[model samples]
Target: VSEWTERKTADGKTYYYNNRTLESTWEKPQELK
Candidate 1:
């Protein structure tokens, strides 16, 4: 399974987090699509 997990900011904006890499991005992770 991928380490990517869906997350949201305080403003309710969507994002993705790679727990394995400890990365956070506002753009949706391509791997999830």
Candidate 2:
């Protein structure tokens, strides 16, 4: 299981970050429908 920390940009967009892989994205939560 990967642990992704939820964070926000200055514009209030949501994103996730993985400490192990140092990877992040702003596309994950955009699919929330």
Candidate 3:
């Protein structure tokens, strides 16, 4: 559903984020959960 890449910052700290989602969700969080 997502992809992760390695990147080095000037502070030498690693970070991450949501890249992509393979599936789509039309339901709300409360309904889905």
Instruction: Name the top lDDT candidate.
Output: 1
Per-candidate TM-score against the hidden true structure: 0.64, 0.55, 0.30
lDDT of 2 at 30: 40
Question: Residue-pair clashes per candidate, as listed?
Answer: 0, 0, 0
lDDT of 2 at 5: 72
- Per-residue C-alpha lDDT of model 2 across residues 1-33, encoded as one tens digit per residue: 566677887888978876667878766634341
Off by over 4 Å in 2: 29-33
> Distance (Å) between predicted and true CA of 4, model 1?
0.6
What C-alpha RMSD separates each model from the true structure? 1.6, 3.5, 9.8
For model 3, residues 1-33, the per-residue Cα lDDT tens digits are 334333456796644422454333333233233
As a whole number from 0 to 100, the lDDT of residue 22 in candidate 2 is: 82
The lDDT of model 1 is 0.81
Candidate 1 lDDT tens digits, 1-33: 688888776897978888999998878767866
Per-model CA lDDT versus the true structure: 0.81, 0.69, 0.39
Residue 15, model 2: lDDT of 83
